[PDB]
Design an enzyme around this catalytic site. Structure first.
Site, PDB file in Angstrom:
ATOM      1  N   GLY A 132       3.158  36.509 -10.956  1.00 25.02           N
ATOM      2  CA  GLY A 132       3.355  35.687 -12.155  1.00 25.02           C
ATOM      3  C   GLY A 132       3.600  34.197 -11.912  1.00 25.02           C
ATOM      4  O   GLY A 132       4.170  33.497 -12.773  1.00 25.02           O
ATOM      5  N   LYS A 163      -0.392  32.725 -13.680  1.00 23.49           N
ATOM      6  CA  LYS A 163      -0.402  31.665 -14.714  1.00 23.49           C
ATOM      7  C   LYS A 163      -1.740  30.931 -14.830  1.00 23.49           C
ATOM      8  O   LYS A 163      -2.137  30.489 -15.915  1.00 23.49           O
ATOM      9  CB  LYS A 163       0.712  30.644 -14.453  1.00 23.49           C
ATOM     10  CG  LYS A 163       2.099  31.149 -14.823  1.00 23.49           C
ATOM     11  CD  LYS A 163       2.295  31.246 -16.352  1.00 23.49           C
ATOM     12  CE  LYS A 163       3.819  31.402 -16.708  1.00 23.49           C
ATOM     13  NZ  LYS A 163       4.284  32.787 -16.337  1.00 23.49           N
ATOM     14  N   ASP A 239       6.826  33.021 -22.023  1.00 25.22           N
ATOM     15  CA  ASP A 239       7.604  32.083 -21.201  1.00 25.22           C
ATOM     16  C   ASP A 239       6.897  30.730 -21.056  1.00 25.22           C
ATOM     17  O   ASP A 239       5.660  30.666 -21.085  1.00 25.22           O
ATOM     18  CB  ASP A 239       7.871  32.698 -19.811  1.00 25.22           C
ATOM     19  CG  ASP A 239       6.577  33.075 -19.067  1.00 25.22           C
ATOM     20  OD1 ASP A 239       6.450  32.706 -17.876  1.00 25.22           O
ATOM     21  OD2 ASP A 239       5.689  33.735 -19.664  1.00 25.22           O
ATOM     22  N   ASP A 240       7.676  29.654 -20.904  1.00 28.41           N
ATOM     23  CA  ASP A 240       7.123  28.343 -20.523  1.00 28.41           C
ATOM     24  C   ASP A 240       6.205  27.777 -21.581  1.00 28.41           C
ATOM     25  O   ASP A 240       5.191  27.168 -21.235  1.00 28.41           O
ATOM     26  CB  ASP A 240       6.281  28.450 -19.249  1.00 28.41           C
ATOM     27  CG  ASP A 240       7.106  28.488 -17.979  1.00 28.41           C
ATOM     28  OD1 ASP A 240       8.135  29.214 -17.937  1.00 28.41           O
ATOM     29  OD2 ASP A 240       6.690  27.790 -17.010  1.00 28.41           O
ATOM     30  N   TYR A 279      14.332  33.143 -21.392  1.00 30.84           N
ATOM     31  CA  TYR A 279      14.248  34.155 -20.350  1.00 30.84           C
ATOM     32  C   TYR A 279      15.289  34.001 -19.271  1.00 30.84           C
ATOM     33  O   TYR A 279      15.314  34.766 -18.305  1.00 30.84           O
ATOM     34  CB  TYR A 279      12.843  34.185 -19.729  1.00 30.84           C
ATOM     35  CG  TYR A 279      12.360  32.882 -19.147  1.00 30.84           C
ATOM     36  CD1 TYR A 279      12.622  32.538 -17.809  1.00 30.84           C
ATOM     37  CD2 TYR A 279      11.587  32.013 -19.913  1.00 30.84           C
ATOM     38  CE1 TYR A 279      12.154  31.339 -17.256  1.00 30.84           C
ATOM     39  CE2 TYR A 279      11.117  30.815 -19.376  1.00 30.84           C
ATOM     40  CZ  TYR A 279      11.391  30.496 -18.051  1.00 30.84           C
ATOM     41  OH  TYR A 279      10.898  29.309 -17.553  1.00 30.84           O
ATOM     42  N   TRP A 334      13.133  39.911 -13.758  1.00 32.76           N
ATOM     43  CA  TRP A 334      12.067  39.123 -13.129  1.00 32.76           C
ATOM     44  C   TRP A 334      12.774  38.175 -12.166  1.00 32.76           C
ATOM     45  O   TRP A 334      13.322  37.166 -12.572  1.00 32.76           O
ATOM     46  CB  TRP A 334      11.303  38.337 -14.220  1.00 32.76           C
ATOM     47  CG  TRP A 334      10.230  37.303 -13.790  1.00 32.76           C
ATOM     48  CD1 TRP A 334      10.283  36.421 -12.724  1.00 32.76           C
ATOM     49  CD2 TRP A 334       8.981  37.029 -14.460  1.00 32.76           C
ATOM     50  NE1 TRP A 334       9.137  35.657 -12.686  1.00 32.76           N
ATOM     51  CE2 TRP A 334       8.334  35.993 -13.745  1.00 32.76           C
ATOM     52  CE3 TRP A 334       8.350  37.564 -15.597  1.00 32.76           C
ATOM     53  CZ2 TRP A 334       7.064  35.490 -14.113  1.00 32.76           C
ATOM     54  CZ3 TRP A 334       7.116  37.042 -15.991  1.00 32.76           C
ATOM     55  CH2 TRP A 334       6.475  36.017 -15.236  1.00 32.76           C
ATOM     56  N   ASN A 336      12.892  35.412  -9.487  1.00 36.50           N
ATOM     57  CA  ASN A 336      12.055  34.320  -9.002  1.00 36.50           C
ATOM     58  C   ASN A 336      12.277  33.934  -7.546  1.00 36.50           C
ATOM     59  O   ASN A 336      12.691  32.857  -7.267  1.00 36.50           O
ATOM     60  CB  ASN A 336      12.168  33.113  -9.904  1.00 36.50           C
ATOM     61  CG  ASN A 336      11.248  33.190 -11.093  1.00 36.50           C
ATOM     62  OD1 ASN A 336      10.143  33.644 -10.991  1.00 36.50           O
ATOM     63  ND2 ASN A 336      11.720  32.744 -12.212  1.00 36.50           N
ATOM     64  N   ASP A 341       6.104  28.049  -5.981  1.00 34.72           N
ATOM     65  CA  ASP A 341       5.191  27.219  -6.745  1.00 34.72           C
ATOM     66  C   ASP A 341       5.770  25.893  -7.214  1.00 34.72           C
ATOM     67  O   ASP A 341       5.063  25.088  -7.784  1.00 34.72           O
ATOM     68  CB  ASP A 341       4.541  27.988  -7.915  1.00 34.72           C
ATOM     69  CG  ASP A 341       5.543  28.444  -8.976  1.00 34.72           C
ATOM     70  OD1 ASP A 341       6.670  27.971  -8.997  1.00 34.72           O
ATOM     71  OD2 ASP A 341       5.187  29.297  -9.800  1.00 34.72           O
ATOM     72  N   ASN A 369       8.796  37.926  -8.206  1.00 37.58           N
ATOM     73  CA  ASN A 369       7.721  36.961  -8.328  1.00 37.58           C
ATOM     74  C   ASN A 369       7.527  36.262  -6.971  1.00 37.58           C
ATOM     75  O   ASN A 369       8.392  35.528  -6.532  1.00 37.58           O
ATOM     76  CB  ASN A 369       8.050  35.954  -9.421  1.00 37.58           C
ATOM     77  CG  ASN A 369       6.894  35.052  -9.761  1.00 37.58           C
ATOM     78  OD1 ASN A 369       5.746  35.384  -9.545  1.00 37.58           O
ATOM     79  ND2 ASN A 369       7.204  33.898 -10.309  1.00 37.58           N
TER      80      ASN A 369
HETATM   81  C1  LIG Z   1       9.528  33.937 -16.409  1.00 33.64           C
HETATM   82  C2  LIG Z   1       9.210  32.844 -15.433  1.00 33.64           C
HETATM   83  O1  LIG Z   1       9.883  32.714 -14.423  1.00 33.64           O
HETATM   84  N1  LIG Z   1       8.138  32.013 -15.742  1.00 33.64           N
HETATM   85  C3  LIG Z   1       7.767  30.949 -14.766  1.00 33.64           C
HETATM   86  C4  LIG Z   1       8.946  30.064 -14.416  1.00 33.64           C
HETATM   87  O2  LIG Z   1       9.629  29.607 -15.328  1.00 33.64           O
HETATM   88  N2  LIG Z   1       9.310  29.720 -13.136  1.00 33.64           N
HETATM   89  C5  LIG Z   1       8.662  30.460 -12.026  1.00 33.64           C
HETATM   90  C6  LIG Z   1       8.956  29.668 -10.756  1.00 33.64           C
HETATM   91  O3  LIG Z   1       8.371  28.361 -10.957  1.00 33.64           O
HETATM   92  C7  LIG Z   1       7.178  30.557 -12.371  1.00 33.64           C
HETATM   93  O4  LIG Z   1       6.421  31.045 -11.261  1.00 33.64           O
HETATM   94  C8  LIG Z   1       7.062  31.533 -13.547  1.00 33.64           C
HETATM   95  O5  LIG Z   1       5.697  31.708 -13.961  1.00 33.64           O
END
Ligand SMILES: CC(=O)N[C@H]1C(=O)N[C@H](CO)[C@@H](O)[C@@H]1O
Length: 645
Positions: A132, A163, A239-240, A279, A334, A336, A341, A369
């Site tokens: 993700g 993404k 998200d985002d 989230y 989830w 991270n 990234d 992730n």
């Molecule tokens: C739910 C979530 O973490 N969404 C994004 C996010 O907010 N941060 C991570 C780390 O940058 C991204 O890889 C991810 O797609």
């Protein structure tokens, strides 16, 4: 070292031989995926009505009736036994039988089996990986390798949601995959099924979704096309994003519609999951109605994802209580890490730690992730699989070592060396850091402190640094040439080159610390050349738009080398009345140090460039000006010059 470690294990400290002749009972009635693995292990051997009994099956099968009381009463649970007289492999369900086999495969070494009894089951229901991240999505070949790895480590969940896949996010989320990608997805699903992994296909429509019939149907139509490709679990990610798509009532209504018109209508759908707009705690509004609305309105079989107290964070009892109280169900985590990234110039190859190990009951699921570097991420993934299956017995360092030995048995020590000094993220906007180089950190800290002060350093600290630099070089050259896992070596190669240069620079700086003026100058000039080489790597490899280049051993080793270099040069300059440059990073342009990022030349928040370049633009912030390709060598006044390079 069994990974994940079983819930219960009794060993006899005796071994038997894997039976050269065996009678197999239940081969026709048991999980075909499990029987296939068993049959591959017994290859060369052969079955008869004589010889050791091997019984395989699920609770309820004829083959395992004798053991029905020993089979754990848990989803994916199993009973395994090996003794002189027979071998038992009995799952509470089909997945349990397969998991029994994955444990059994680990027990078997050099045609021998330990005498053991195991009762085992996972503490967390859903365990696995969310692809993700932002960045280059995993290749098809990487994903095939990942799915097999998850089966081996009892991960039952792969959530597909890169993404930057345009058929996943906006705006082509509405479009079916082209034929080529669709046939690949179809193969991934078959391979997932073979390895007992739920392939969960996620969609990320929130940025441009309209709350109307047309987009709802297009979403459903997309889900139907994925179903035709074999997909049986589904996710919607919000998200985002910003705008209307962040509406919680509408999100919940869409998810309930998918649930009621799709998930509960097909014969065989499994997981339905959503990732909320809020989230993590920091991105939540404690005084807003978002999370409570989701909690109240979302159908109770629908999972809700959570990254913790922050975008990047580890999971605590208090943190998960906070979310669970609002969403009215146990969060589906989830996590991270090791996703890189937002620190793309770093590899994150250190242990998995920081998550509370007593909170299994407070979570529906736990997925990691990872990095866009698929093989490199297996260290963390293996560790996460171990943690989620048996968090009570989770052992950070042993699991890290086990992961590394599993992934690269031919060069495990070398990969440990590399990974141990490639752990931290460096400073970042998410405030998330990891330990690195902690073995030598004290020796480093003492050496530097003494040296800077004009007090004598311990010789043993000097020798430990020497030992470290030597082992780094051996590890770098051996990994570069390793052919056991080529895709892994391709991923890490640029960092391996940088890591070797780091170690050589360290050796030379230590020689500077130790003879005469002539020698010192030879060492100094060598170090300058190595700085330049490190620059060239940082400028030519991994040139992404966000954090280009290649950083390594950044937490302890590089600052130690740099600070030692600056110090000894100062001393030389005092002793010999000289003016040697003490700067530690090579910078071809002259002016706070300048930085070069892609075709940008910036002052760390009059410049003379090493040549005349066509100017592109200048951006200042205490402002912007197009330079319209004008020749530029000098700029006189963020402070960023962009050039054509
Ligand atoms: C739910 C979530 O973490 N969404 C994004 C996010 O907010 N941060 C991570 C780390 O940058 C991204 O890889 C991810 O797609």
């Amino acid at each position: 070292s069994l990974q994940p470690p079983p819930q219960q294990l009794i060993v006899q400290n005796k071994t038997i031989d894997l039976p050269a002749v065996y009678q197999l009972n239940g081969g026709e009635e048991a999980n075909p995926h499990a029987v296939k693995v068993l049959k591959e292990l017994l290859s060369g051997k052969q079955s008869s009505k004589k010889g050791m009994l091997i019984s395989i099956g699920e609770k309820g099968d004829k083959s395992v009736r004798k053991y029905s009381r020993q089979i754990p009463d848990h989803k994916e649970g199993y009973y395994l036994s090996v003794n002189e007289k027979e071998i038992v492999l009995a799952g509470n369900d089909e997945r349990g039988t397969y998991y029994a086999l994955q444990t059994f495969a680990q027990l078997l070494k050099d045609g021998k089996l330990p005498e053991v009894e195991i009762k085992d089951y996972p503490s967390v229901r859903y365990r696995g990986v969310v692809e993700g991240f932002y960045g280059t999505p995993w290749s098809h070949q990487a994903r095939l390798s990942q799915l097999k790895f998850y089966g081996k480590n009892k991960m039952n969940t792969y959530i597909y949601g890169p993404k930057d896949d345009p058929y996943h996010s906006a705006p082509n989320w509405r479009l079916p995959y082209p034929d080529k990608e669709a046939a690949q997805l179809q193969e991934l699903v078959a391979v997932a099924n073979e390895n007992e992994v739920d392939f969960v296909w996620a969609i990320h429509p929130g940025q441009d979704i309209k709350w109307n019939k047309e987009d709802r149907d297009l979403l459903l139509a997309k889900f139907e096309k994925m179903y035709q490709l074999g997909v049986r679990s589904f996710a919607v990610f919000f998200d985002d994003i910003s705008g209307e798509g962040t509406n919680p009532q509408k999100q919940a209504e869409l998810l309930n519609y998918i649930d009621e018109k799709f998930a509960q209508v097909k014969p065989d759908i499994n997981q339905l999951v959503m990732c909320p707009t809020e989230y993590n705690k920091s991105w939540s509004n404690p005084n807003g109605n978002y999370l409570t609305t989701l909690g109240d309105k979302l159908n109770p079989s629908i999972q809700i994802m959570w990254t913790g107290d922050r975008v990047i964070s580890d999971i605590t009892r208090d943190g998960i209580s906070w979310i669970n109280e609002r969403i009215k169900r146990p969060a589906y985590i989830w996590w991270n890490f090791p996703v890189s990234d937002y620190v793309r110039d770093h590899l994150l190859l250190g242990p998995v730690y920081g998550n509370d190990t007593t909170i299994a009951k407070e979570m529906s699921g736990f997925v990691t992730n990872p990095m866009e570097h698929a093989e490199s991420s297996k260290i963390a993934i293996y560790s996460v699989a171990s943690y989620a299956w048996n968090p009570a017995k989770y052992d950070t360092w042993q699991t890290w070592k086990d992961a590394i030995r599993t992934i690269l048995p031919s060069a495990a020590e070398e990969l440990e060396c590399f990974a141990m000094h490639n752990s931290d993220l460096g400073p970042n906007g998410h405030g998330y850091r990891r330990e690195e180089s902690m073995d030598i950190q004290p020796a480093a800290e003492r050496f530097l402190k003494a040296f800077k002060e004009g007090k004598n350093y311990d010789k043993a600290d000097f020798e430990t640094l020497q030992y470290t630099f030597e082992r780094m070089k051996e590890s770098a050259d051996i990994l570069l040439m390793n052919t056991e896992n080529k895709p892994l070596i391709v991923e890490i190669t640029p960092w391996v080159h940088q890591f070797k240069l780091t170690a050589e620079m360290g050796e030379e700086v230590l020689k500077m610390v130790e003879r005469n003026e002539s020698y010192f100058l030879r060492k100094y000039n060598h170090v300058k050349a190595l700085q330049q080489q490190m620059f060239y790597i940082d400028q030519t490899s991994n040139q992404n738009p966000y954090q280009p280049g290649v950083k390594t051993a950044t937490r302890v080793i590089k600052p130690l080398i740099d600070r030692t270099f600056a110090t000894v040069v100062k001393f030389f300059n005092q002793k010999f009345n000289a003016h040697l440059d003490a700067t530690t990073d090579y910078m071809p342009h002259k002016m706070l140090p300048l930085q070069v990022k892609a075709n940008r030349v910036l002052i760390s928040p009059e410049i003379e460039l090493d040549a005349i370049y066509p100017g592109e633009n200048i951006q200042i912030n205490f402002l912007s000006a197009g330079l319209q390709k004008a020749p530029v060598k000098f700029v006189r006044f963020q402070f960023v010059l962009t050039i054509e390079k």
